[PDB]
Amino acid sequence: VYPKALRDEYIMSKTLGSGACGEVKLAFERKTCKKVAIKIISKNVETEIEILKKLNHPCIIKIKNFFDAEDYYIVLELMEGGELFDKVVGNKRLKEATCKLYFYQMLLAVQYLHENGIIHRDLKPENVLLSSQEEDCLIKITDFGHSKILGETSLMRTLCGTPTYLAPEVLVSVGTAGYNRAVDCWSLGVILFICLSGYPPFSEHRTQVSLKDQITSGKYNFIPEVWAEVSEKALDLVKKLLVVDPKARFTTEEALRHPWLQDEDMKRKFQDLLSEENESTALPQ
Amino acid sequence: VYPKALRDEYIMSKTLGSGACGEVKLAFERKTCKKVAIKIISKNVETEIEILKKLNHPCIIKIKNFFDAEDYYIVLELMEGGELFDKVVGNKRLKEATCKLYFYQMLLAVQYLHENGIIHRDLKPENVLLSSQEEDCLIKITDFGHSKILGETSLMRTLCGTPTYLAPEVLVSVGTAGYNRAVDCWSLGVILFICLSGYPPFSEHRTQVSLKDQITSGKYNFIPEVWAEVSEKALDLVKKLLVVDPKARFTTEEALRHPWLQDEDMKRKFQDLLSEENESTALPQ
Ligand SMILES: C/C(=N\Nc1ncc[nH]1)c1ccc(NC(=O)c2cc3cccc([N+](=O)[O-])c3[nH]2)cc1
Ligand SMILES: C/C(=N\Nc1ncc[nH]1)c1ccc(NC(=O)c2cc3cccc([N+](=O)[O-])c3[nH]2)cc1
């Protein structure tokens, strides 16, 4: 049975989805009679909730409520469009315009995370939720289970002293430290590749090369026929995100300044979708 | 003034030492009238205490009491010999025999840490305490302020899934992961070098090469005249600990099996010092 304090506030309904350690249910908030989603995580979820309670961005999910019972229950706003995964599965692909709208929002979300010292580390189509069943909708990033808070590092503390007794490998790691966030830009690149083409850049399908070797050489699977209808600009961005050196890789800022995203129609549609979502209280002047 | 709960149990006395964020005082336990040391740390000290409360080895300091007040107060057994630092400062050097006794204990201490999933990360002569003012004494490792508990890593969790969306640098790091403990073997190597020779292997004294370059090339400063009186075996061990590749570096096990430590007289003296320290309760048979 559901925990009493959850049943007290919400009437639980049908299943909307079902992940590995969890499941998502439709619920009705008793006070308002409005629909919510409730994510169940079976037994640092509590610290995932505190990360998410701090963040305030339209393209990142918000926690409405939380119950820590036999299992964890996370209440959030309904995302009726479901997962992005379902739009790209089975070689389905989105219009290039729709890819741009979605991707712009993802970049804004992840930029906001990185500005706020948070790395997601598990960006995938499964973790991108769509607001509605309409093509032109808002998206939100979810599932912060693998996320990490950037702070003062062990390395930074060590380098304040004299390294008389310090191991060489620690000194060598200074070259590449502080680029953990680049893992999210790589994932975005892979997500963009999938959205534009309907297939994954790295995959064991009809190849001899190991997945690991595909990834570390950066040699994505390019099938000209699938890509011919896609613009050069969109593929150019993909290529700047799938750079194997994390220091040369495009950051979210660099991506947002890329020609592919200098598209005032797309941006207008995003802004229009935002005000439509919003319900403010009346302003002076 | 000292906190009331500390004054309740102990009478505070003279200063024995004074580190950067702290100071060490002589105290008398009221109940027993026996001497203790009290380390003051001015404001994860509390988790350093919990690490130390779990460990049980004769060459690692034990916490007798702890007070978290305006400052932190850590009560421990008196180590009347003081810091090892003071035995090696000003180009002073220990007899080779004394170096072996001390170093054997350090290896046993650090082996015990690594077997128990703890890396110290700040092994230095300042953090080695001596039991008595006699040459042949027990030593204890102290100051676990930079220590880290080894556990299930982010990497291990990532590698359980398929790396479709995983950045190449994460896959590359698999080659060298799980060798963090080797930093302690390097420090031990530096400590041994200093003990045997009376001077530091890496240092900015009369050289053009930067400290960092000295360390990452592993090119220690070898002065033949200082070393001529030291055995080949002792220097051979030093060289196997000051290896720049952390995977080729000697572990504490490898060091303990080194010819330099196959010395039954040294080991006899260690065992004799242990039973002397100990006060058991009577045994059946
Ligand atoms: C925060 C979180 N997971 N965190 C963790 N932490 C460790 C494992 N999961 C979520 C994971 C998935 C979530 N999914 C949904 O809200 C959702 C999925 C879904 C599928 C179809 C339809 C809807 N819907 O709201 O209409 C849907 N909503 C929401 C939250
Ligand atoms: C646990 C710890 N420090 N932890 C942390 N954590 C962040 C910064 N320090 C210690 C650091 C140093 C300690 N030093 C001593 O007990 C000590 C130093 C010293 C010097 C001369 C004589 C004695 N003595 O006990 O007779 C001495 N005892 C003891 C504990």
XYZ file of C-alpha atoms and ligand atoms in Angstrom:
630
model
C 0.000 0.000 0.000
C 0.934 3.674 -0.476
C 2.171 5.526 2.661
C -0.554 7.195 4.706
C 0.912 10.709 4.436
C 0.906 10.393 0.637
C -2.686 9.038 0.518
C -3.653 11.923 2.831
C -2.806 14.549 0.166
C -3.166 12.672 -3.132
C -5.424 10.108 -4.823
C -3.218 7.665 -6.740
C -4.116 6.559 -10.217
C -2.743 4.804 -13.297
C 0.821 4.081 -14.370
C 2.392 6.559 -16.807
C 5.840 4.917 -17.028
C 8.132 2.420 -15.252
C 11.941 2.822 -14.952
C 14.427 0.329 -13.442
C 14.344 1.122 -9.704
C 11.021 2.949 -10.084
C 7.723 3.701 -11.770
C 5.776 6.931 -12.471
C 2.089 7.243 -11.487
C -0.668 9.715 -12.256
C -2.090 11.306 -9.112
C -4.578 13.996 -8.159
C -3.755 16.552 -5.546
C -6.723 16.562 -3.161
C -6.570 20.282 -2.356
C -6.685 21.441 -6.009
C -8.027 18.392 -7.958
C -5.208 18.867 -10.453
C -3.019 16.192 -11.961
C 0.519 15.523 -10.835
C 3.126 12.876 -11.544
C 4.538 10.796 -8.736
C 7.880 9.112 -9.246
C 8.458 6.045 -7.068
C 12.057 5.070 -6.298
C 12.314 1.694 -4.566
C 14.640 0.938 -1.668
C 21.284 10.049 -1.662
C 17.774 10.456 -3.131
C 17.158 12.931 -0.300
C 20.160 15.030 -1.414
C 18.987 14.781 -5.054
C 15.747 16.395 -3.756
C 17.720 19.173 -2.007
C 19.733 19.870 -5.172
C 16.465 20.065 -7.126
C 14.740 22.273 -4.483
C 17.479 24.880 -5.003
C 17.380 25.051 -8.818
C 14.908 27.371 -10.514
C 14.831 27.067 -14.311
C 11.863 26.397 -16.651
C 13.728 23.497 -18.363
C 14.585 21.635 -15.139
C 11.958 19.653 -13.217
C 10.634 21.020 -9.939
C 9.782 18.982 -6.823
C 6.288 19.714 -5.491
C 6.468 17.224 -2.689
C 8.508 14.363 -1.295
C 7.774 11.358 0.904
C 10.473 9.137 2.345
C 8.562 6.000 3.396
C 9.052 2.287 2.630
C 9.969 3.710 -0.792
C 10.694 7.272 -1.992
C 7.863 9.235 -3.626
C 8.620 12.387 -5.566
C 5.686 14.503 -6.648
C 6.118 16.779 -9.652
C 4.198 18.575 -12.371
C 2.762 16.391 -15.112
C 4.800 16.181 -18.336
C 2.124 14.804 -20.615
C 4.424 14.466 -23.612
C 6.352 11.734 -21.794
C 10.020 10.906 -22.406
C 11.976 12.180 -25.454
C 13.220 8.597 -25.775
C 9.834 7.583 -27.219
C 10.095 10.212 -29.998
C 13.446 8.871 -31.202
C 13.087 5.098 -30.721
C 12.702 2.740 -33.718
C 14.678 5.039 -36.061
C 11.981 7.704 -35.735
C 13.298 11.195 -36.177
C 12.129 14.671 -35.408
C 11.935 17.561 -37.881
C 15.202 19.516 -37.836
C 13.229 22.532 -36.512
C 11.853 20.435 -33.627
C 15.386 19.171 -32.805
C 16.575 22.768 -32.595
C 13.757 23.816 -30.237
C 14.350 20.872 -27.912
C 18.126 21.147 -28.027
C 18.143 24.892 -27.334
C 16.217 24.167 -24.120
C 18.554 21.349 -23.102
C 21.551 23.731 -23.552
C 19.834 26.390 -21.471
C 19.095 23.805 -18.764
C 22.627 22.415 -18.685
C 24.185 25.924 -18.886
C 22.124 26.826 -15.831
C 23.360 23.672 -14.029
C 27.026 24.358 -14.796
C 26.690 28.056 -13.800
C 25.262 26.767 -10.507
C 28.047 24.201 -9.893
C 25.986 21.109 -10.725
C 26.927 18.396 -13.259
C 24.110 16.036 -14.304
C 26.232 13.110 -15.575
C 23.359 11.039 -17.019
C 21.881 13.148 -19.813
C 19.933 10.735 -22.100
C 16.639 10.847 -24.035
C 15.046 8.918 -21.127
C 15.825 11.909 -18.857
C 14.302 14.574 -21.052
C 10.554 15.050 -20.477
C 8.167 16.802 -22.858
C 5.417 19.194 -21.635
C 2.712 18.194 -24.078
C 1.942 15.873 -26.983
C 2.398 18.862 -29.360
C 5.677 18.994 -31.312
C 6.432 22.532 -30.196
C 6.577 22.135 -26.424
C 8.762 22.865 -23.433
C 11.107 20.165 -22.248
C 12.521 19.501 -18.780
C 15.602 17.649 -17.705
C 14.980 15.112 -14.943
C 16.653 12.318 -12.907
C 19.479 13.886 -10.898
C 20.467 10.564 -9.304
C 24.015 10.690 -10.730
C 24.462 14.445 -10.342
C 27.423 15.984 -8.511
C 27.925 19.353 -6.799
C 31.137 21.101 -7.844
C 33.030 22.598 -4.909
C 36.517 23.152 -3.553
C 38.499 20.104 -4.562
C 41.055 17.963 -2.754
C 43.476 19.103 -5.453
C 42.913 22.802 -4.704
C 43.637 22.210 -1.004
C 46.821 20.212 -1.790
C 48.189 22.901 -4.125
C 47.979 25.491 -1.314
C 50.983 23.755 0.334
C 54.503 22.983 -0.854
C 54.568 19.640 -2.773
C 57.711 18.231 -1.100
C 55.848 14.960 -0.309
C 53.281 15.081 -3.131
C 53.064 12.283 -5.718
C 53.765 13.155 -9.382
C 50.375 11.854 -10.612
C 48.656 14.462 -8.473
C 50.718 17.237 -10.128
C 49.979 15.768 -13.572
C 46.219 15.807 -12.928
C 46.325 19.619 -12.583
C 46.489 19.826 -16.394
C 43.043 18.374 -16.897
C 41.231 19.159 -13.595
C 38.013 21.194 -13.421
C 36.547 19.896 -16.738
C 34.159 17.282 -15.245
C 31.251 19.389 -16.658
C 32.392 18.558 -20.198
C 30.897 15.042 -19.782
C 27.468 16.704 -20.045
C 28.389 18.473 -23.308
C 29.450 15.124 -24.775
C 26.100 13.517 -23.830
C 24.245 16.479 -25.312
C 26.219 15.874 -28.533
C 25.110 12.258 -28.581
C 21.504 13.263 -27.856
C 21.606 15.815 -30.670
C 23.087 13.210 -33.075
C 20.250 10.807 -32.258
C 17.541 13.464 -32.550
C 18.796 14.621 -35.999
C 19.464 11.188 -37.492
C 17.249 8.688 -35.648
C 20.218 6.408 -34.822
C 23.082 6.344 -32.222
C 26.606 7.527 -33.198
C 28.281 4.773 -31.213
C 26.735 1.347 -31.178
C 27.665 -2.312 -31.689
C 25.225 -2.669 -34.600
C 26.880 -4.134 -37.726
C 30.475 -3.225 -36.743
C 33.714 -4.924 -35.730
C 34.971 -2.029 -33.628
C 34.266 -2.226 -29.924
C 31.928 0.408 -28.433
C 34.779 1.603 -26.206
C 37.147 2.085 -29.170
C 34.432 3.884 -31.162
C 33.945 6.326 -28.294
C 37.595 7.017 -27.331
C 38.621 7.583 -30.976
C 35.542 9.783 -31.524
C 34.804 7.895 -34.708
C 31.025 8.118 -34.872
C 29.075 6.093 -37.418
C 28.275 8.466 -40.292
C 25.645 7.192 -42.766
C 25.451 9.850 -45.562
C 21.925 8.923 -46.706
C 20.308 9.484 -43.309
C 22.200 12.834 -42.940
C 21.687 14.287 -46.482
C 18.371 15.898 -45.485
C 19.974 17.397 -42.298
C 21.642 20.833 -42.550
C 25.446 21.309 -42.487
C 25.102 23.711 -39.523
C 23.375 21.079 -37.332
C 26.037 18.498 -38.105
C 28.802 21.076 -37.533
C 27.530 21.567 -33.952
C 27.300 17.824 -33.397
C 30.939 17.545 -34.384
C 32.079 20.272 -31.989
C 30.334 18.480 -29.089
C 31.705 15.028 -29.963
C 35.332 16.154 -29.535
C 37.354 13.613 -27.546
C 39.623 16.146 -25.764
C 37.391 17.502 -22.956
C 39.262 20.832 -22.903
C 38.728 21.456 -26.645
C 35.085 20.287 -26.448
C 32.365 22.932 -26.875
C 30.922 24.243 -23.634
C 27.204 25.053 -23.369
C 28.071 28.738 -24.003
C 29.942 27.925 -27.181
C 27.042 25.757 -28.395
C 24.488 28.514 -27.667
C 26.548 30.905 -29.781
C 26.797 28.374 -32.663
C 25.197 29.469 -36.003
C 22.653 26.603 -35.776
C 21.023 28.250 -32.729
C 21.013 31.806 -34.080
C 17.413 31.261 -35.170
C 14.994 33.984 -34.094
C 11.889 31.944 -35.057
C 12.901 29.048 -32.832
C 13.659 31.460 -29.977
C 10.281 33.214 -30.462
C 8.500 29.863 -30.197
C 10.384 29.075 -26.980
C 9.432 32.439 -25.411
C 5.798 31.959 -26.494
C 5.677 28.524 -24.918
C 7.035 29.992 -21.647
C 4.409 32.744 -21.187
C 1.689 30.266 -22.122
C 2.996 27.971 -19.253
C 3.129 30.906 -16.777
C 0.330 32.273 -14.431
C 1.497 35.491 -12.687
C -0.210 37.600 -10.045
C -0.558 41.121 -11.563
C 2.232 43.733 -11.761
C 2.594 47.428 -10.944
C 3.031 49.201 -14.336
C 38.812 29.627 28.377
C 38.665 25.840 27.895
C 35.152 24.315 27.529
C 33.517 23.275 30.792
C 33.081 19.613 29.808
C 36.815 19.392 29.069
C 37.809 21.121 32.352
C 35.420 18.718 34.123
C 37.540 15.666 33.176
C 41.038 17.091 32.654
C 43.431 19.635 34.180
C 45.134 21.516 31.339
C 48.824 22.220 31.417
C 51.747 23.356 29.268
C 52.157 23.506 25.502
C 53.927 20.548 23.871
C 53.639 21.734 20.245
C 51.738 24.176 17.993
C 50.635 23.384 14.400
C 48.953 25.761 11.910
C 45.242 25.515 12.791
C 46.069 24.047 16.209
C 48.285 23.450 19.213
C 48.987 20.400 21.430
C 48.734 20.655 25.242
C 49.752 18.434 28.129
C 46.796 17.473 30.314
C 46.059 15.247 33.287
C 43.058 13.005 33.326
C 41.333 13.671 36.654
C 40.091 10.108 37.175
C 43.534 8.469 36.776
C 46.051 11.348 37.295
C 47.857 10.208 34.159
C 49.192 12.376 31.378
C 47.462 12.784 28.049
C 47.933 14.988 25.012
C 45.157 17.264 23.864
C 45.176 18.465 20.283
C 43.293 21.720 19.692
C 41.934 22.372 16.197
C 40.586 25.905 15.793
C 37.386 26.787 13.959
C 34.997 17.063 8.773
C 37.085 16.861 11.973
C 34.170 14.894 13.441
C 34.408 12.329 10.609
C 38.214 12.199 11.044
C 37.417 11.166 14.662
C 34.998 8.452 13.454
C 37.594 7.091 11.010
C 40.128 7.002 13.856
C 37.650 5.399 16.331
C 37.305 2.448 13.936
C 41.017 1.757 13.352
C 42.896 -0.478 15.769
C 46.641 -0.702 15.102
C 49.591 -0.029 17.464
C 51.215 2.368 14.928
C 48.121 4.552 14.428
C 47.007 7.073 17.060
C 43.926 6.340 19.144
C 41.300 8.879 20.262
C 40.623 8.747 24.009
C 38.147 11.568 24.002
C 36.710 14.342 21.873
C 35.064 17.689 22.572
C 33.375 19.765 19.900
C 33.099 23.218 21.514
C 34.172 26.706 20.376
C 37.153 24.721 19.053
C 37.766 20.967 18.625
C 39.697 19.133 21.353
C 41.071 15.674 20.700
C 42.469 13.779 23.652
C 45.042 11.071 22.997
C 47.867 9.144 24.614
C 51.073 11.073 25.200
C 53.824 10.594 22.594
C 56.737 11.936 24.584
C 59.230 11.585 21.747
C 57.388 14.304 19.824
C 57.342 14.611 16.027
C 59.768 12.706 13.741
C 60.242 16.042 11.970
C 62.444 17.225 14.855
C 64.793 14.221 14.457
C 65.445 14.985 10.787
C 65.483 18.805 10.697
C 68.747 20.748 10.189
C 70.365 17.931 8.156
C 70.283 15.667 11.214
C 70.047 12.020 10.340
C 69.134 8.844 12.105
C 71.246 5.678 12.244
C 70.321 3.386 9.347
C 69.082 0.832 11.933
C 66.793 3.457 13.510
C 65.429 4.409 10.047
C 64.573 0.764 9.433
C 62.724 0.388 12.756
C 60.682 3.540 12.195
C 60.003 2.819 8.539
C 58.895 -0.769 9.175
C 56.238 0.616 11.540
C 55.103 3.261 9.059
C 54.665 0.511 6.394
C 52.679 -1.615 8.820
C 50.492 1.391 9.676
C 49.865 2.363 6.060
C 49.344 -1.295 4.999
C 46.682 -1.517 7.694
C 45.043 1.694 6.381
C 44.974 0.491 2.770
C 43.647 -2.968 3.798
C 40.879 -1.074 5.614
C 40.017 1.215 2.658
C 41.597 4.376 4.076
C 44.185 6.581 2.315
C 46.039 9.079 4.532
C 47.186 11.535 1.824
C 49.406 13.700 4.062
C 52.178 11.405 5.280
C 55.072 13.681 6.415
C 57.604 13.679 9.279
C 55.316 16.167 11.095
C 52.607 13.454 11.174
C 54.743 10.701 12.624
C 54.881 10.744 16.443
C 57.475 8.963 18.572
C 56.563 7.098 21.808
C 59.599 8.050 23.849
C 62.846 10.014 23.737
C 64.723 6.690 23.275
C 65.948 5.909 19.743
C 64.304 2.499 19.709
C 60.651 3.401 20.208
C 57.218 2.851 18.736
C 55.905 5.402 16.295
C 52.323 6.379 15.466
C 50.871 7.996 12.408
C 48.601 10.949 13.166
C 46.605 13.789 11.523
C 43.903 12.203 9.363
C 42.536 15.581 8.231
C 43.196 14.848 4.534
C 42.297 11.159 4.697
C 39.744 9.561 2.369
C 37.590 6.430 2.668
C 37.760 4.195 -0.404
C 34.352 2.915 -1.495
C 32.268 2.160 -4.560
C 33.203 4.788 -7.101
C 31.176 6.852 -9.554
C 33.185 5.075 -12.247
C 32.144 1.607 -11.044
C 28.467 2.624 -11.149
C 28.821 4.113 -14.671
C 30.509 0.983 -16.055
C 27.519 -1.146 -14.970
C 25.511 0.447 -17.832
C 26.049 0.634 -21.584
C 28.288 3.645 -22.469
C 26.190 4.904 -25.415
C 26.172 8.446 -23.915
C 29.419 8.227 -21.921
C 32.301 10.641 -22.579
C 35.625 9.190 -23.814
C 37.652 10.687 -20.925
C 35.616 8.620 -18.493
C 36.493 5.422 -20.415
C 40.161 6.469 -20.537
C 40.285 6.954 -16.755
C 39.489 3.241 -16.261
C 43.140 2.484 -17.094
C 44.489 4.238 -14.038
C 41.551 4.137 -11.556
C 41.794 2.531 -8.109
C 45.464 3.511 -7.475
C 44.792 6.566 -5.243
C 46.509 4.630 -2.380
C 49.819 4.821 -4.259
C 50.119 8.508 -3.220
C 50.873 7.232 0.300
C 53.658 4.929 -0.949
C 55.258 7.895 -2.721
C 55.196 9.993 0.487
C 56.669 7.086 2.434
C 59.476 7.003 -0.166
C 60.161 10.679 0.398
C 60.065 10.208 4.181
C 62.489 7.292 3.920
C 64.830 9.347 1.671
C 64.883 12.151 4.245
C 65.405 9.809 7.199
C 68.375 8.043 5.504
C 70.088 11.134 4.098
C 69.027 14.105 6.243
C 67.890 16.121 3.187
C 64.791 16.219 0.871
C 64.897 14.514 -2.571
C 62.947 17.308 -4.221
C 63.618 20.859 -3.190
C 64.348 24.279 -4.702
C 67.711 24.504 -2.915
C 70.589 25.315 -5.306
C 68.806 24.145 -8.494
C 67.365 25.586 -11.697
C 64.734 22.889 -12.127
C 61.295 23.683 -10.786
C 60.011 21.570 -7.867
C 57.135 20.379 -10.063
C 59.487 19.217 -12.846
C 61.764 17.481 -10.320
C 58.791 15.537 -8.975
C 57.041 14.573 -12.252
C 60.315 13.388 -13.843
C 61.214 11.501 -10.640
C 64.677 12.997 -10.774
C 65.570 13.190 -7.096
C 68.672 15.049 -5.952
C 71.355 12.405 -5.371
C 74.437 13.614 -3.447
C 76.890 10.630 -3.402
C 78.818 11.787 -0.312
C 75.774 11.898 1.966
C 74.650 8.437 0.663
C 78.031 6.571 0.712
C 77.542 5.508 4.348
C 73.947 4.296 3.585
C 73.461 0.689 2.397
C 72.581 -0.208 -1.225
C 69.490 -2.115 -0.007
C 68.009 0.979 1.708
C 68.523 3.102 -1.386
C 67.114 0.330 -3.609
C 63.830 0.494 -1.643
C 63.766 4.279 -1.841
C 64.028 3.997 -5.602
C 61.155 1.519 -5.888
C 58.891 3.889 -3.907
C 59.862 7.003 -5.885
C 58.588 5.538 -9.176
C 56.539 8.083 -11.133
C 54.058 5.581 -12.657
C 51.619 4.897 -9.778
C 50.808 1.415 -11.122
C 54.484 0.339 -11.205
C 55.159 1.935 -7.788
C 55.817 -0.413 -4.850
C 52.803 -1.083 -2.665
C 53.198 -1.414 1.114
C 53.217 -5.227 0.670
C 56.026 -5.088 -1.851
C 58.040 -2.792 0.443
C 57.527 -5.107 3.449
C 58.895 -7.991 1.390
C 61.940 -5.935 0.262
C 65.384 -7.295 1.356
C 66.004 -4.152 3.471
C 63.178 -5.158 5.849
C 64.085 -8.843 6.108
C 65.932 -8.045 9.333
C 65.058 -10.294 12.266
C 66.853 -8.066 14.823
C 64.818 -5.023 13.843
C 61.611 -7.082 13.970
C 62.560 -8.486 17.413
C 63.045 -4.948 18.725
C 59.628 -3.940 17.375
C 57.906 -6.919 19.061
C 59.744 -6.181 22.329
C 58.631 -2.568 22.257
C 55.007 -3.709 21.744
C 54.771 -6.049 24.768
C 56.511 -3.430 26.896
C 53.722 -0.922 25.831
C 50.948 -3.477 26.570
C 49.071 -4.170 29.917
C 46.771 -7.225 29.554
C 44.301 -8.733 31.997
C 45.442 -12.367 32.548
C 44.774 -15.285 30.164
C 43.481 -18.846 30.479
C 46.489 -21.116 29.678
C 13.735 12.841 -10.205
C 13.551 11.534 -10.995
N 14.330 10.483 -10.716
N 15.262 10.493 -9.891
C 15.967 9.365 -9.675
N 16.956 9.227 -8.789
C 17.520 7.886 -8.840
C 16.685 7.195 -9.893
N 15.730 8.223 -10.307
C 12.553 11.398 -11.974
C 12.663 10.429 -12.980
C 11.662 10.317 -13.943
C 10.529 11.137 -13.945
N 9.591 10.930 -14.899
C 8.401 11.551 -15.014
O 7.987 12.472 -14.301
C 7.485 11.054 -16.146
C 7.675 10.044 -17.010
C 6.585 10.001 -17.794
C 6.193 9.191 -18.862
C 4.971 9.414 -19.492
C 4.122 10.439 -19.059
C 4.508 11.242 -17.984
N 3.740 12.231 -17.535
O 4.135 13.056 -16.461
O 2.531 12.540 -18.146
C 5.734 11.018 -17.371
N 6.317 11.638 -16.365
C 10.412 12.082 -12.944
C 11.414 12.208 -11.971
C 44.503 13.989 14.933
C 45.460 15.185 14.783
N 45.153 16.168 13.930
N 44.161 16.167 13.177
C 43.939 17.225 12.372
N 42.895 17.371 11.554
C 42.985 18.618 10.808
C 44.257 19.246 11.329
N 44.733 18.287 12.326
C 46.628 15.297 15.554
C 47.696 16.096 15.127
C 48.847 16.186 15.907
C 48.982 15.510 17.123
N 50.122 15.688 17.831
C 50.401 15.198 19.055
O 49.685 14.440 19.718
C 51.744 15.633 19.668
C 52.663 16.484 19.182
C 53.649 16.542 20.092
C 54.860 17.234 20.163
C 55.693 17.067 21.266
C 55.325 16.217 22.316
C 54.109 15.533 22.251
N 53.712 14.712 23.220
O 52.493 14.006 23.149
O 54.514 14.462 24.327
C 53.292 15.699 21.140
N 52.125 15.163 20.845
C 47.923 14.735 17.554
C 46.760 14.632 16.776
